[PDB]
Tab-separated table of C-alpha atoms and ligand atoms in Angstrom:
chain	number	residue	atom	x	y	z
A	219	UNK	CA	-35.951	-6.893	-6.983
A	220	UNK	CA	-33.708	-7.427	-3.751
A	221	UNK	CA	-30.430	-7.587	-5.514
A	222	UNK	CA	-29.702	-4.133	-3.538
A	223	UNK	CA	-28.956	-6.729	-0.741
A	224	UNK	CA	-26.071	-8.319	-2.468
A	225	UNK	CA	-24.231	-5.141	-3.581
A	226	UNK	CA	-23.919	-3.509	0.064
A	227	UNK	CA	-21.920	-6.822	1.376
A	228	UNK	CA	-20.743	-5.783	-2.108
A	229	UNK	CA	-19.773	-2.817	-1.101
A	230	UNK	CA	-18.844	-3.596	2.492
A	231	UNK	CA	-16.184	-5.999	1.297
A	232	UNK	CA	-14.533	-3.380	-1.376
A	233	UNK	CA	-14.658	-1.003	1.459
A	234	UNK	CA	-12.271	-3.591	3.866
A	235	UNK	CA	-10.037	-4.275	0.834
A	236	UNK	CA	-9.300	-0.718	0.329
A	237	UNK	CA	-9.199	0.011	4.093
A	238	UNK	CA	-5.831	-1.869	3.604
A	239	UNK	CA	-5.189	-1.411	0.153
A	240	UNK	CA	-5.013	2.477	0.577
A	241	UNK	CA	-3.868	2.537	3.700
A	242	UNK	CA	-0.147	1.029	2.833
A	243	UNK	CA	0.575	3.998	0.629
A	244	UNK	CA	-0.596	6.626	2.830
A	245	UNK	CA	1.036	4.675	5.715
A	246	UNK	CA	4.538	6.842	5.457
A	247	UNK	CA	2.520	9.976	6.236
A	248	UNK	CA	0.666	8.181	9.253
A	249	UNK	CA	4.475	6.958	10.837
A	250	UNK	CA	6.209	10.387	9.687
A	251	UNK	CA	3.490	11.806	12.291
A	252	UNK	CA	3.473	9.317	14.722
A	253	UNK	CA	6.970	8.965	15.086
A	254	UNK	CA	8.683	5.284	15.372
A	255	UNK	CA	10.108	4.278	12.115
A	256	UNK	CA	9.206	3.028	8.503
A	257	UNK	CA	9.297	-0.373	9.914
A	258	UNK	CA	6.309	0.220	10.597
A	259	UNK	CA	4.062	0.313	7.498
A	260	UNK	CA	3.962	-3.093	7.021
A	261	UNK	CA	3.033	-3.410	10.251
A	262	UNK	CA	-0.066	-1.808	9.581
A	263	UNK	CA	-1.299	-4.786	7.442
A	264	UNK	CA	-0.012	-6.886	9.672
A	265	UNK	CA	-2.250	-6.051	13.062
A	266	UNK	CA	-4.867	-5.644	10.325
A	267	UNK	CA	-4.409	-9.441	8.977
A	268	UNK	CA	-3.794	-10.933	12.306
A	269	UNK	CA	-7.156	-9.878	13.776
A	270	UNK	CA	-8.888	-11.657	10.839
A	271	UNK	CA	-7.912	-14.803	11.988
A	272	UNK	CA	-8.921	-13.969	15.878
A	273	UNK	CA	-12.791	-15.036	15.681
A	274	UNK	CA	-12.476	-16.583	11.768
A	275	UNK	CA	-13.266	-19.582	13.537
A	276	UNK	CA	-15.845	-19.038	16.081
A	277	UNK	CA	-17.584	-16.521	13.693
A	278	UNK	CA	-18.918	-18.856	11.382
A	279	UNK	CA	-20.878	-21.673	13.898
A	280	UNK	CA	-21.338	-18.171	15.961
A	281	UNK	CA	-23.762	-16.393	13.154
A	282	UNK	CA	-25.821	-19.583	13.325
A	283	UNK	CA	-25.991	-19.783	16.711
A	284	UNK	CA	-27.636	-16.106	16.856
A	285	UNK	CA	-29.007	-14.956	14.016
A	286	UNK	CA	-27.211	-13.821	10.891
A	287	UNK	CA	-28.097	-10.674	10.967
A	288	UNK	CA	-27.702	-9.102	14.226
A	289	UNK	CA	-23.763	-10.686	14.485
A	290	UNK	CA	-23.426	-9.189	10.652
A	291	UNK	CA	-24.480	-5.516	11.621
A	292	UNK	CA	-22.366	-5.720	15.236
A	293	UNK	CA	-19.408	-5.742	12.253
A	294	UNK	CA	-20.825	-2.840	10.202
A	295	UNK	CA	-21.024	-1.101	13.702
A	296	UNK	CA	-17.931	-2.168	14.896
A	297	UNK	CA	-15.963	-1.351	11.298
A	298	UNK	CA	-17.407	2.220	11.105
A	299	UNK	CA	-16.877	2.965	14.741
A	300	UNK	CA	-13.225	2.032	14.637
A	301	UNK	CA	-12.869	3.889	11.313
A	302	UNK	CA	-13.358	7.216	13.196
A	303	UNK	CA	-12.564	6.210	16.713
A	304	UNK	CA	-8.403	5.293	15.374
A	305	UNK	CA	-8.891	8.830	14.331
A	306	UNK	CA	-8.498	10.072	17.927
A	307	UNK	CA	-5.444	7.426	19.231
A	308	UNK	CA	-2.724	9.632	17.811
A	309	UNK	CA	0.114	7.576	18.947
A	310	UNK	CA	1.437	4.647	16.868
A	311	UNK	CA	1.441	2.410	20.031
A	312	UNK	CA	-2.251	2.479	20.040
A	313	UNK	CA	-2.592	3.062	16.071
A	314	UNK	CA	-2.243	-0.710	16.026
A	315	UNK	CA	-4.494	-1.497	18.665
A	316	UNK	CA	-7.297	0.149	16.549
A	317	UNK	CA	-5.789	-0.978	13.483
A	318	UNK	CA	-5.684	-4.404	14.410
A	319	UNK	CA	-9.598	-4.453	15.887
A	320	UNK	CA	-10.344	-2.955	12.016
A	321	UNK	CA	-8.890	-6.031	11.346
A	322	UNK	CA	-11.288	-8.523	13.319
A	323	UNK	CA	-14.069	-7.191	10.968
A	324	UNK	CA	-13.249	-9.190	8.256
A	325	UNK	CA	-14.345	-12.526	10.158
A	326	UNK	CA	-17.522	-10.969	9.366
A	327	UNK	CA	-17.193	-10.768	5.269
A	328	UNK	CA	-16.995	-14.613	4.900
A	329	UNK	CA	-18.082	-16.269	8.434
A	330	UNK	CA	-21.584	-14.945	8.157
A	331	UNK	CA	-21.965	-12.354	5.164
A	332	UNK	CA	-20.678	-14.882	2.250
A	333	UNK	CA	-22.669	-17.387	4.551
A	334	UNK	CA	-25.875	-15.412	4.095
A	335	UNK	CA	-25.730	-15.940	0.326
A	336	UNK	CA	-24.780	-19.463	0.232
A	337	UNK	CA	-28.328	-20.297	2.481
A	338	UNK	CA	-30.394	-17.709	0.721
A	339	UNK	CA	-30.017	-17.080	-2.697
A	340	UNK	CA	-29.308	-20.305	-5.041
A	341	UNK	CA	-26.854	-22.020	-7.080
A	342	UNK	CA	-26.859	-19.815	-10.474
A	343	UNK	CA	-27.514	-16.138	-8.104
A	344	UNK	CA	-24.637	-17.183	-6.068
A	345	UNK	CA	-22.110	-17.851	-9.232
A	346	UNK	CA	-22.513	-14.606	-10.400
A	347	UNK	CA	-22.511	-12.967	-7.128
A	348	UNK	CA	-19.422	-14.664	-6.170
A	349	UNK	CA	-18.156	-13.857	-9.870
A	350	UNK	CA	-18.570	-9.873	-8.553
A	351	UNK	CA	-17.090	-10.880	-5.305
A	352	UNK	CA	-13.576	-11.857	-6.523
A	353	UNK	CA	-13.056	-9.381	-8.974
A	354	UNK	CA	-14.065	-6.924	-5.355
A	355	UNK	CA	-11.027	-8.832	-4.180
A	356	UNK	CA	-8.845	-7.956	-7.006
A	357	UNK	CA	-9.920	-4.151	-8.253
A	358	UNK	CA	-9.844	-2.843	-4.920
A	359	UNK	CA	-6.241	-4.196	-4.318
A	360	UNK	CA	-5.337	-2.813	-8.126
A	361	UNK	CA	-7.177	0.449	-7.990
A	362	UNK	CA	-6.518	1.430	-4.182
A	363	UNK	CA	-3.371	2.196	-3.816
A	364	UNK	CA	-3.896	4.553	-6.680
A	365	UNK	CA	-6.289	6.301	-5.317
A	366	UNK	CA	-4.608	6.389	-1.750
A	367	UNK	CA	-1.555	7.912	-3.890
A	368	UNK	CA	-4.586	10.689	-5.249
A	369	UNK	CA	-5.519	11.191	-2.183
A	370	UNK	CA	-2.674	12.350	0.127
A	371	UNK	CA	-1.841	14.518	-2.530
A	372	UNK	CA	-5.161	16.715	-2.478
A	373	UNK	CA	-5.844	15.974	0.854
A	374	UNK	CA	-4.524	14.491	4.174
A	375	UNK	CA	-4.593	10.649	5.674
A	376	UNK	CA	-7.759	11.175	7.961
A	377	UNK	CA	-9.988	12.184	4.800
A	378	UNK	CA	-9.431	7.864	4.235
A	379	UNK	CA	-11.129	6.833	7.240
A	380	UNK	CA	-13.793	8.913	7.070
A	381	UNK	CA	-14.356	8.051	3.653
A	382	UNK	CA	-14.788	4.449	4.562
A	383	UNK	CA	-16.659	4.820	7.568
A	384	UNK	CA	-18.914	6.684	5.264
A	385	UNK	CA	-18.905	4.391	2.475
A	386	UNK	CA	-19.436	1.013	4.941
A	387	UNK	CA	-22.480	3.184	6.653
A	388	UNK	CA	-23.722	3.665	2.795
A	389	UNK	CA	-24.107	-0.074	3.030
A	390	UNK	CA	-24.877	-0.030	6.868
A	391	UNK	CA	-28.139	1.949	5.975
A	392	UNK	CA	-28.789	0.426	2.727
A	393	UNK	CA	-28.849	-2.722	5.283
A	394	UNK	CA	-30.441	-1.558	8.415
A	395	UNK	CA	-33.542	-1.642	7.129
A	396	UNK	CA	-32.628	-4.454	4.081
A	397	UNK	CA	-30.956	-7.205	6.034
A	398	UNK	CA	-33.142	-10.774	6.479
A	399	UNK	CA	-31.302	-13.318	8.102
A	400	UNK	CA	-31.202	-16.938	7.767
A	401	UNK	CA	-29.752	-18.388	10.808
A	402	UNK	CA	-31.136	-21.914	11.677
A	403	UNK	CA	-29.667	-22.511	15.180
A	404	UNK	CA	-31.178	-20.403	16.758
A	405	UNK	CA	-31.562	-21.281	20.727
A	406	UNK	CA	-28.606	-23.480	20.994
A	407	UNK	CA	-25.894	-24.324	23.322
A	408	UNK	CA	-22.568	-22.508	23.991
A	409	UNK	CA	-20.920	-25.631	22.796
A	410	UNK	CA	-17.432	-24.337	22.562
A	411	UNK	CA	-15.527	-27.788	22.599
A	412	UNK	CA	-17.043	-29.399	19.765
A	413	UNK	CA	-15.212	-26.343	17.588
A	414	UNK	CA	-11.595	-27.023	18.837
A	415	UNK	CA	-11.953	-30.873	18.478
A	416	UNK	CA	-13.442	-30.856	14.491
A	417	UNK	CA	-10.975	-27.933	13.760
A	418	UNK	CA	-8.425	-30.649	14.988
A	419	UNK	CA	-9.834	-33.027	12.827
A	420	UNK	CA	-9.498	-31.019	9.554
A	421	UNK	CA	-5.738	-29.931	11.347
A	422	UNK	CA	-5.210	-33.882	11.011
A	423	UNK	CA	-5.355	-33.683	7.142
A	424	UNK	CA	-1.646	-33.808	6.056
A	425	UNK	CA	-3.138	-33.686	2.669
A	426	UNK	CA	-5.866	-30.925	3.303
A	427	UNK	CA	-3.239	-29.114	5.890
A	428	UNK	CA	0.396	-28.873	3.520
A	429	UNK	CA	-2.022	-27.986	1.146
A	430	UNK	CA	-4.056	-24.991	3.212
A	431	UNK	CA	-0.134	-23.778	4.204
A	432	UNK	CA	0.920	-23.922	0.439
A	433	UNK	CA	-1.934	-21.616	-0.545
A	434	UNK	CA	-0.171	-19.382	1.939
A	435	UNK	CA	3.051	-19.634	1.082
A	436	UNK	CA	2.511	-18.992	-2.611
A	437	UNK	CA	0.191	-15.979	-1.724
A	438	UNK	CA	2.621	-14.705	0.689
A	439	UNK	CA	4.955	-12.639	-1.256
A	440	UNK	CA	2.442	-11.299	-3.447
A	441	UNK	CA	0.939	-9.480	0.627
A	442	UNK	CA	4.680	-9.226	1.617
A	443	UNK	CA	5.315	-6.693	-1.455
A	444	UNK	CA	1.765	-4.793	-0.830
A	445	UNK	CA	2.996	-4.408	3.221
A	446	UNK	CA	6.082	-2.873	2.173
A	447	UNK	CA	5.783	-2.148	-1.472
A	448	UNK	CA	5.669	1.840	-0.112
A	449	UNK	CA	8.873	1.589	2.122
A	450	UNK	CA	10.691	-0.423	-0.612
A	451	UNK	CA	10.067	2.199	-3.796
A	452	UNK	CA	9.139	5.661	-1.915
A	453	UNK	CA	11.584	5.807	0.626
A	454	UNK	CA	13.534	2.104	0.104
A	455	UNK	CA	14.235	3.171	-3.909
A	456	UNK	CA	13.245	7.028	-3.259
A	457	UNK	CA	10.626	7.360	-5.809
A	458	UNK	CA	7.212	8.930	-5.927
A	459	UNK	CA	3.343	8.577	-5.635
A	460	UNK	CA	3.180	8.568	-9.527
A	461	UNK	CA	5.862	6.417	-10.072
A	462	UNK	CA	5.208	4.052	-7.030
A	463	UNK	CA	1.600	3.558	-7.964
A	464	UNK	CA	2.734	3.243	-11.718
A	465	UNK	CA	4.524	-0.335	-10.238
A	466	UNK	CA	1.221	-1.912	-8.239
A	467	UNK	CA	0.020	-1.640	-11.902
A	468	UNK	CA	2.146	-4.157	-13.484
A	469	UNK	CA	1.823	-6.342	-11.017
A	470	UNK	CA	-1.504	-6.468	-10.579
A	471	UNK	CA	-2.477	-6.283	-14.178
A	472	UNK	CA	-0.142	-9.404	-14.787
A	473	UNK	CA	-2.762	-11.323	-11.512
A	474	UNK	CA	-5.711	-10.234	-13.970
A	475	UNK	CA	-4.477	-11.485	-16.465
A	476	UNK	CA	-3.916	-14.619	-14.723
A	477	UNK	CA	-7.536	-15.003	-14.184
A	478	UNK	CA	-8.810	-13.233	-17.267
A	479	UNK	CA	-7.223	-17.209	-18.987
A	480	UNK	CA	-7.755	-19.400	-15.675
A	481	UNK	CA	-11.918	-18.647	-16.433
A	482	UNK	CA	-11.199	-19.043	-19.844
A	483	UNK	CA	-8.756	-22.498	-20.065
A	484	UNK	CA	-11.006	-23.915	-16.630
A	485	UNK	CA	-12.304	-25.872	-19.538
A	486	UNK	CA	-10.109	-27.179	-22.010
A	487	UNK	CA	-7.526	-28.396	-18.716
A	488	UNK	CA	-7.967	-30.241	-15.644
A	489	UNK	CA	-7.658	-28.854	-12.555
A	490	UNK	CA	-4.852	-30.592	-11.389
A	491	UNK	CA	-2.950	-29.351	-14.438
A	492	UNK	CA	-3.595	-25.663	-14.056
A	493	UNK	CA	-1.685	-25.930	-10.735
A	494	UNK	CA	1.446	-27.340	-12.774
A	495	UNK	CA	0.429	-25.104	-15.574
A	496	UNK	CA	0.224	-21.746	-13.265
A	497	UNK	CA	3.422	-23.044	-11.565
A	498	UNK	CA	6.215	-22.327	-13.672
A	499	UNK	CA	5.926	-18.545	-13.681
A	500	UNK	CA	5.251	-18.790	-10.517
A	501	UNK	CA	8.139	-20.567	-10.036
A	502	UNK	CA	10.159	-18.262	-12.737
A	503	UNK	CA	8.898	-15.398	-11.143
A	504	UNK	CA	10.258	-15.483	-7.265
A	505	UNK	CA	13.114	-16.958	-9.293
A	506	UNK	CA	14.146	-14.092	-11.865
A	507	UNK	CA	12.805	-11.274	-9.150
A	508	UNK	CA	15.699	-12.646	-6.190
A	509	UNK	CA	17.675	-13.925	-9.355
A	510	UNK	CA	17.917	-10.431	-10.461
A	511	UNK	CA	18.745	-8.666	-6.678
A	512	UNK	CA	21.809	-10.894	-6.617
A	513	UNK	CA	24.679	-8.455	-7.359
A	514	UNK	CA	22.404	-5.297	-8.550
A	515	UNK	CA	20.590	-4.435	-5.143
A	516	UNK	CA	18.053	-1.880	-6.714
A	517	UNK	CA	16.827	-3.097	-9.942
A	518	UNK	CA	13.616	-2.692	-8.400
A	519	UNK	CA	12.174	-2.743	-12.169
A	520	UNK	CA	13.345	-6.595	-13.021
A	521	UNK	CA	11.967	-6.958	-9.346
A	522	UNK	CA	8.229	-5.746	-10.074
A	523	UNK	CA	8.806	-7.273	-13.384
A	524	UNK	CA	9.565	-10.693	-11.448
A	525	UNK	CA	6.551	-10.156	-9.420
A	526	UNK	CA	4.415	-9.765	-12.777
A	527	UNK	CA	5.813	-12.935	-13.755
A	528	UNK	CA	4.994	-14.600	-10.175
A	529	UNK	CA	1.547	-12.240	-10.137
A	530	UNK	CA	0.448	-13.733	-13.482
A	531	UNK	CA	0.979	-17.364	-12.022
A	532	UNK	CA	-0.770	-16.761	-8.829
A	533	UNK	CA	-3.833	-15.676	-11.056
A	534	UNK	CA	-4.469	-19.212	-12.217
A	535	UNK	CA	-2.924	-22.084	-9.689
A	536	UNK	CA	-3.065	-20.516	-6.892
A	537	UNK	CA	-7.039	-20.077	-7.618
A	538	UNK	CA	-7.617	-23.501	-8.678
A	539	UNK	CA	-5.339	-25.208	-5.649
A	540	UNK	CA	-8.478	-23.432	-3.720
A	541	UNK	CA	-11.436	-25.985	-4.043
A	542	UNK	CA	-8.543	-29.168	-4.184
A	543	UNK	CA	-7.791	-28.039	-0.589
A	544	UNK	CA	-11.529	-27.316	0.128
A	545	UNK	CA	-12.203	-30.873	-1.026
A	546	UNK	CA	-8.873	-32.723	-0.007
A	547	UNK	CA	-10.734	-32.826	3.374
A	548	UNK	CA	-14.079	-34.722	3.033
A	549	UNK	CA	-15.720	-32.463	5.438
A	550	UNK	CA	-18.048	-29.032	6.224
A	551	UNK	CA	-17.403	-26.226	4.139
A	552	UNK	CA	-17.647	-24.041	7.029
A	553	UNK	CA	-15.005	-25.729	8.970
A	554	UNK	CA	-12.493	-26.056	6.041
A	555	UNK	CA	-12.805	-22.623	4.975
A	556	UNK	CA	-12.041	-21.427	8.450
A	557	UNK	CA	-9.455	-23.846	9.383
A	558	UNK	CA	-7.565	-22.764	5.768
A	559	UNK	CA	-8.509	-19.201	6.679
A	560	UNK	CA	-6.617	-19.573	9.740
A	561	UNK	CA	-3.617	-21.023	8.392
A	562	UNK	CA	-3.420	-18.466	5.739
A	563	UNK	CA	-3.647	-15.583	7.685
A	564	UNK	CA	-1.126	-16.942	10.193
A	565	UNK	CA	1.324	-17.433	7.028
A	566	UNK	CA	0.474	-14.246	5.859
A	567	UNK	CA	0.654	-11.913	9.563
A	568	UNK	CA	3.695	-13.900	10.723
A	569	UNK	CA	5.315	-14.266	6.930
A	570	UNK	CA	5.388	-10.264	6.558
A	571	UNK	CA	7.062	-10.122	9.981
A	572	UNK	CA	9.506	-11.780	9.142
A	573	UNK	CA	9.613	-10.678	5.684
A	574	UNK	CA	9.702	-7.206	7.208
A	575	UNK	CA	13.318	-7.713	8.783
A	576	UNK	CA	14.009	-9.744	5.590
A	577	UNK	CA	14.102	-5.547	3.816
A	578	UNK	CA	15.864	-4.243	6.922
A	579	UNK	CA	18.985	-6.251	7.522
A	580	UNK	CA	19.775	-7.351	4.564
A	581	UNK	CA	18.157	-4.732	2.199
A	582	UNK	CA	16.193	-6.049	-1.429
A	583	UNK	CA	18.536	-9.385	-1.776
A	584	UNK	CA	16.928	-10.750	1.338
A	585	UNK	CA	13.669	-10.004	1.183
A	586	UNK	CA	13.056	-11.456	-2.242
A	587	UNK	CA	15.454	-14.651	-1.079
A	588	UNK	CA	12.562	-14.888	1.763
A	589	UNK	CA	10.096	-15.192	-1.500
A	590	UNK	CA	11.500	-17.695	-3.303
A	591	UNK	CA	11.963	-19.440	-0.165
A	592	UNK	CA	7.796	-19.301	-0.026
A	593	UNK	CA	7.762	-20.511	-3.827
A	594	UNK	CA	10.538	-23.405	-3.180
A	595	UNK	CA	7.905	-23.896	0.270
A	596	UNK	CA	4.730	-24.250	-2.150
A	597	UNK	CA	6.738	-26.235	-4.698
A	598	UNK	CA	8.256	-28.537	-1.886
A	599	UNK	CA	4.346	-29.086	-1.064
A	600	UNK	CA	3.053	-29.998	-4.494
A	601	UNK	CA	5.744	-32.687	-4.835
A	602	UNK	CA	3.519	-34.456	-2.016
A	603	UNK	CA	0.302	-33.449	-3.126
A	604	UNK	CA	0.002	-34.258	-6.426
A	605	UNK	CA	2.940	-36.780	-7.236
B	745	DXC	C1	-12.416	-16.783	1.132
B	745	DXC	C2	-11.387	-15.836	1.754
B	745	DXC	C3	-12.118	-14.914	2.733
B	745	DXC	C4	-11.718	-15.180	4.182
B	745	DXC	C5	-10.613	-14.230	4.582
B	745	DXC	O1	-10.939	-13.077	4.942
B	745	DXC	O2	-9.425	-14.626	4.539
B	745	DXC	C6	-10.569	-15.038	0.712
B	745	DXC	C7	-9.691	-13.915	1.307
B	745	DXC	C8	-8.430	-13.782	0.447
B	745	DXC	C9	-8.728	-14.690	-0.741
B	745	DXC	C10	-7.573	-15.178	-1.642
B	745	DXC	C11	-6.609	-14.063	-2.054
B	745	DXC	C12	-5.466	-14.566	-2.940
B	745	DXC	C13	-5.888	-15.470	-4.112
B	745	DXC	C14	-6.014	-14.592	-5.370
B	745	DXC	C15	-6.357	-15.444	-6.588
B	745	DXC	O3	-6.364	-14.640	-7.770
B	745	DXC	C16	-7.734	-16.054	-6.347
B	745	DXC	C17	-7.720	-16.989	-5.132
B	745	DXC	C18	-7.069	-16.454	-3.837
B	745	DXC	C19	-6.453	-17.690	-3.170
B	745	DXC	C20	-8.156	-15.864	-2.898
B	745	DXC	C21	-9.281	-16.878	-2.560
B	745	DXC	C22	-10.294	-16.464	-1.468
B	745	DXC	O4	-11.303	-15.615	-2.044
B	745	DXC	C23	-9.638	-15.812	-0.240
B	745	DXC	C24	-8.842	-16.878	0.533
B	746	PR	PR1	-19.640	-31.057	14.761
């Protein structure tokens, strides 16, 4: 009767996926516009990830402290505002300060919205929730950029961002009058120093810690492509919207495929296998996708073909490696989730960055070099935490 509630954080989280998953195609138009250089479009995703991980932390113990619901809808506000008010910056020196405050709204899709079903609804309405809530995680990063490839061609950038604003205030009024809340410290202290200390205890795990960094390591050049996956085929390899979205496909339908047999062999295989199991094409991917940029600079093909081998493997160990790292700490789920959150993100912002000048100065070779450096990273940190 009240699974309405469910579907608009539903829909609020496809909405931030896309936001960024849209975005990174149609990002050329926004810098041929704004005027600074293709440099950049990554750097879109990047003020976008690194305000994420601004209040992941304090988000989560915050939403208690308040109420879940008021702290849940000052995000729908603030997402919709700032998806019409960046609109109205016009320059790119500014773009990112409104980019990157788009970006602090996604504190608000785990911290206290995922929070909100793991108090309320129970153990078998959660699985199949959460079962709807990855696969919003991985059609709106396959399916995005195809329509944000559709959707400069019929119509301009800004018809995006009001599209989202739109679509988040389709959940924002399907939840200003639908929204309980289940906060249960309410009227308590601003205790900000018991945060930093506990993070600091979960930031003593060399076990849980390696093992939070590996998860962003191996993930890394699967974001580093989608940052500059435009800038390396449309104007990097010169090709266009048809043929450029035609290679996110691929890819992505290599990371399904990856979890269509992860669900599928969770059962006849341990865990602790899958990771080794998952690994090798991991490992074979950033291995054959630099391996192949070695003398031929611009087989971009064997390149998104390597990165369908490493997209397949991320599917299954890099999914299972989750809960080991959740549980290689024997601690809150809350604080883990943050404190890997944080570590991720930080990987991921500051990985691109570099990974960005990794495509400049040194072209494809490079950049794909500074992948299989994140897969020899991962690797180098599952020879300590397995074996
Ligand atoms: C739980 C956080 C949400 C907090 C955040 O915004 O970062 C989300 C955000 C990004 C998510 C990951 C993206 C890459 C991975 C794709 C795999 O095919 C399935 C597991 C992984 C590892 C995901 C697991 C998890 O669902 C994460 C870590
Ligand atoms: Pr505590």
């Amino acid at each position: 009767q009240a699974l309405l509630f469910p579907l608009c954080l539903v829909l609020y989280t496809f909405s931030t996926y896309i936001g960024n998953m849209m975005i990174q195609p149609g990002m050329l138009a926004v810098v041929e516009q704004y005027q600074a250089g293709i440099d950049w479009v990554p750097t879109s995703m990047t003020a976008y990830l690194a305000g994420g991980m601004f209040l992941q932390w304090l988000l989560g113990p915050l939403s208690d402290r308040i109420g879940r619901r008021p702290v849940m809808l000052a995000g729908v506000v603030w997402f919709i505002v700032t998806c019409l008010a960046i609109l109205l910056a016009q320059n790119i020196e500014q773009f990112t300060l409104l980019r990157f405050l788009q970006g602090i709204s996604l504190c608000f899709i785990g911290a206290v919205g995922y929070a909100a079903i793991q108090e309320s609804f129970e153990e078998a309405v959660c699985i199949k929730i959460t079962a709807l809530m990855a696969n919003v995680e991985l059609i709106a990063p396959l399916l995005g950029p195809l329509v944000g490839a559709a959707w400069i061609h019929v119509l301009p950038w800004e018809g995006m961002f009001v599209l989202f604003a739109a679509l988040a205030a389709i959940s924002f009024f399907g939840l200003q009058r639908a929204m309980p809340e289940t906060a249960t410290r309410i009227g308590e202290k601003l205790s900000l120093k018991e945060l930093g200390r506990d993070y600091k205890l979960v930031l003593k795990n060399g076990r849980f810690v390696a093992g939070a960094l590996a998860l962003g390591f191996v993930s890394l050049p699967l974001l580093a492509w989608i940052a500059q996956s435009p800038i390396i085929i449309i104007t990097g390899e010169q090709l266009s919207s048809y043929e450029y979205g035609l290679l996110q496909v691929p890819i992505f339908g290599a990371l399904i495929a990856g979890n269509l047999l992860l669900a599928r062999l969770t059962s006849r295989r341990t865990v602790r296998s899958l990771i080794i199991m998952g690994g090798w094409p991991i490992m074979i991917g950033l291995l054959v996708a630099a391996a192949a940029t070695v003398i031929s600079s611009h087989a971009y093909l064997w390149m998104t073909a390597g990165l369908s081998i490493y997209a397949f493997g991320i599917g299954l160990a890099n999914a299972g490696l989750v809960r080991l790292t959740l549980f290689a700490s024997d601690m809150s789920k809350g604080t883990v989730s943050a404190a890997m959150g944080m570590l991720q993100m930080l990987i991921f912002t500051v990985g691109i960055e570099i990974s960005k000048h990794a495509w400049l100065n040194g072209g494809n070779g490079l950049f794909n070099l500074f992948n299989l450096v994140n897969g020899i990273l991962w690797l180098s940190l599952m020879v300590i935490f397995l074996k």
